[PDB]
Structure 1
Amino acid sequence: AALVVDNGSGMCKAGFAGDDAPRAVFPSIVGRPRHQGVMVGMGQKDSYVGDEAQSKRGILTLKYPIEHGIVTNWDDMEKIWHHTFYNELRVAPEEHPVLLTEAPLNPKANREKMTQIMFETFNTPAMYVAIQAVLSLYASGRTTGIVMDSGDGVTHTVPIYEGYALPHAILRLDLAGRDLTDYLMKILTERGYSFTTTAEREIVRDIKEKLCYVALDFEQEMATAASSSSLEKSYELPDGQVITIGNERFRCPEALFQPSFLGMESCGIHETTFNSIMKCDVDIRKDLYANTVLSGGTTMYPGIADRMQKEITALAPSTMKIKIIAPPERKYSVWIGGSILASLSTFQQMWISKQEYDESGPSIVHRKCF
């Protein structure tokens, strides 16, 4: 009996260890109303969470507590965990031990405060933090190979050989799904369709998920998109109003491969994977080329694998064979790894108990990382 709770900046995937899919999946967001001194009606909650905040977008100011995979507002983060445990899962944190997920090369303060809250506030019997990239290997049952776990906050590439990580080869990029949404809003406004407010930002994100796809040849696709109006598709808003996205449809995801558009002054996601392999040992490079895994929900763009294959192949040697591993279920690949690891009898020893926390302190999390 154990709980797996992924602390994603976009979506919170929670469930019991051994389960195939997460039980409770909701957006990690807090919505507080823009209330004036004028009297309000009955059934009014001071702060809404998840589906409720998504339903009442009109009045509620939506503030993500996690910014670039870092918890900015810890008080709101506790309210997300409180809704997750008590309301969504319908389980006491005192009963089951909780498996948590961290991004690589995160600030040390996150682990320190994380463990304090779970043991002190929630009084959990045990808590273990795991690397998202390491868990995704358990989902694929592969000890060797690199993973490109691209989230809403950040994107990172962690190469692991025969279940041994190369810490020097780990690369972190702040470019992620949330930055793409803000880019799409700007270029849609230039077309004519203006989106300013927090509620409108969420509507544009829902539009992005439906229409946007990755082009194989960016210049040729834009040249063809300029010529013909076959790619131009219509989208119906919550209001009767209908919009035509046009050439901007496939323009948004290009920023991942060419960050110069957003102005990141960094290398593309395909260059990050290649650069990481170059930092890795010469012998194991062959196996990393053979096992390039794509993880997270930011790699669910249609035809991203086709563009990735072309770009990596160009960078890689001509003699070398480059194989990209893109399973249908990438979105829940990190959580499934957590469920498999938590289910494994070996992991039973890895749990940090309340007694161990009290004796050692919050510094115990830093010792039992890797």
Structure 2
Amino acid sequence: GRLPACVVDCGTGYTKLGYAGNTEPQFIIPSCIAIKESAKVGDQAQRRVMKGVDDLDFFIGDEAIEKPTYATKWPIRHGIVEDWDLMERFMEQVIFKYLRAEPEDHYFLLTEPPLNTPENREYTAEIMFESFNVPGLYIAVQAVLALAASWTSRQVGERTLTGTVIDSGDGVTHVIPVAEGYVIGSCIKHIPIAGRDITYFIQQLLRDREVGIPPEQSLETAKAVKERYSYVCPDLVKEFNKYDTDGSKWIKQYTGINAISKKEFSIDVGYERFLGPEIFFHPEFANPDFTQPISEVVDEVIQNCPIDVRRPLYKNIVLSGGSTMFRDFGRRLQRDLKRTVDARLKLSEELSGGRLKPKPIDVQVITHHMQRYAVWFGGSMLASTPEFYQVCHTKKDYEEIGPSICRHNPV
């Protein structure tokens, strides 16, 4: 009968695949593509030239991350698709090999990062409508799906249709204010830090401190210590002193296996336990030209929103995406915000002589178990609804108007 629409979330770290109406994605796969590298013998003078069926000799996902004779490429960068040649191939095997959905009769929900240039929406619709032959497509704003995932999962009676959603994927962090289900797009701010920058900062810091990690596995170990040993610290200068004095308890051994010799190797894990995710609060570490802490940006977003909605937003700050999963992350963000807002009120008592005391503001930062796939889940619930088939761009629309139907966006 009626076949479920497909949901594809083209993350910068992990693409997430499945069909509408499921509580989980059917596949989580790293958004990389392995291509045959032997062309590099000729390709010394110019980029690899394809002939025959050589461009079908590629692998994606876990089939591609450690193959011995293929060069892994990472097509997506800051959420944007940077090499459409490789992404177009990546889509082919996603649809036909993994999902095994014939595109001709499945609607697609395909996610977008809020920073996406209009030109890149034209290309993505053009590939889905014209390289494939999708009957209808909907480019959906990741942040709204993340909020709805929390809305539909969280306890009844606290299902507020308003919140500030912080989405930190692997590429970029977005802070999106929502009121009554409408995105206040004017007030969006972007923080140019995410999982990659945390990984690279650990990767650099290990390569200063701990030579002996083989370069091929330098990225693997930086990723592993990040996900397993790192935490958001309470106070930086004091933490260094804690590590210097009680190093016997704070320094942790990590043991790795050599990809080639299969000898074991081991390292101390140290300051890069709390350094790393600290770059959210001190972006100047990883990024030369950004300096506002996340707990500063979030308040500037809310305090630009209409005066009525500001108080509702502080009650429902939603964390989303895997880079928000560090231990104690939300606890510190709340503390920094609370220290910022209560002082803002206290000033307005003195500038009013204490004749009236303002009601406090209840900064609350909320977290939920979907966070590895929350955007996808929010899409799969949307795509189950009958309204989705009314909202989608129908293929006939792309016949009457070109790619230009996908110029627009929430901003």
Q: Measure, in 2, the Cα distance between the counterparts of 1:83 and 1:295.
A: 28
Matched, 1:82 2:92: yes
Deviation at 1:250, TM superposition (A): 1.6
Partner SS for 1:339:
helix
Q: Measure, in 2, the Cα distance between the counterparts of 1:314 and 1:61.
A: 49
Q: Measure, in 2, the Cα distance between the counterparts of 1:267 and 1:31.
A: 38
Q: 1:267 maps to which residue?
A: 292
Deviation at 1:54, TM superposition (A): 1.7
Q: Measure, in 2, the Cα distance between the counterparts of 1:105 and 1:291.
A: 23
Q: Measure, in 2, the Cα distance between the counterparts of 1:155 and 1:103.
A: 10
Q: Contact 2:118/2:408 (CA < 8 Å) preserved in 1?
A: no
CA 22–226 in structure 1, closer or farther in 2 if over 3 Å, else same: same
Matched, 1:166 2:184: yes
Q: 1:320 maps to which residue?
A: 361
Letter paired with 1:305: G
Q: How does 1:201-216 map to 2 (within 5 A)?
A: 201-216=219-234
Deviation at 1:202, TM superposition (A): 3.3
Q: 2:310 maps to which residue?
A: 285
Greater C-alpha radius of gyration: 2
Q: 2:386 maps to which residue?
A: 345
CA 31–204 in structure 1, closer or farther in 2 if over 3 Å, else same: farther
Q: Contact 1:213/1:250 (CA < 8 Å) preserved in 2?
A: yes
Deviation readout 1:170-204 (Å, 9 max, x if unpaired): 11122111111111111111212355746532342
Of 28, 31, 44, 2:34 maps to 31
Deviation readout 1:289-329 (Å, 9 max, x if unpaired): 00110001110111111111111111122521111111122
Q: Contact 1:129/1:369 (CA < 8 Å) preserved in 2?
A: no
Q: 1:191 maps to which residue?
A: 209
Q: Contact 2:331/2:365 (CA < 8 Å) preserved in 1?
A: no
Letter paired with 1:237: G
Deviation at 1:169, TM superposition (A): 0.7
The sequence identity of aligned pairs, in percent, is 39
Measured on the aligned residues, the alpha-carbon RMSD in Å equals 2.1
Of 346, 354, 363, 2:395 maps to 354
Matched, 1:152 2:155: no
Of 251, 257, 263, 1:232 maps to 251
Q: Measure, in 1, the Cα distance between the counterparts of 2:408 and 2:334.
A: 39
Deviation at 1:86, TM superposition (A): 1.1
Q: Measure, in 1, the Cα distance between the counterparts of 2:304 and 2:122.
A: 30
TM norm structure 1: 0.93
Of 84, 91, 110, 1:100 maps to 110
Q: Measure, in 1, the Cα distance between the counterparts of 2:393 and 2:37.
A: 42
Unaligned runs of 5+ in 1: 39-44
Matched, 1:51 2:62: yes
TM norm structure 2: 0.84
Q: Measure, in 2, the Cα distance between the counterparts of 1:248 and 1:204.
A: 9
Could you tell which deviates more after superposition, 233-242 or 21-30?
Answer: 233-242
Deviation at 1:105, TM superposition (A): 3.0
Partner SS for 2:250:
coil
Aligned residues: 364
Q: 1:18 maps to which residue?
A: 21
Could you tell which deviates more after superposition, 317-326 or 300-309?
Answer: 317-326
Partner SS for 2:257:
coil
Unaligned runs of 5+ in 2: 43-55, 152-159, 259-263, 344-359
Q: Contact 1:126/1:354 (CA < 8 Å) preserved in 2?
A: yes
Letter paired with 1:31: A
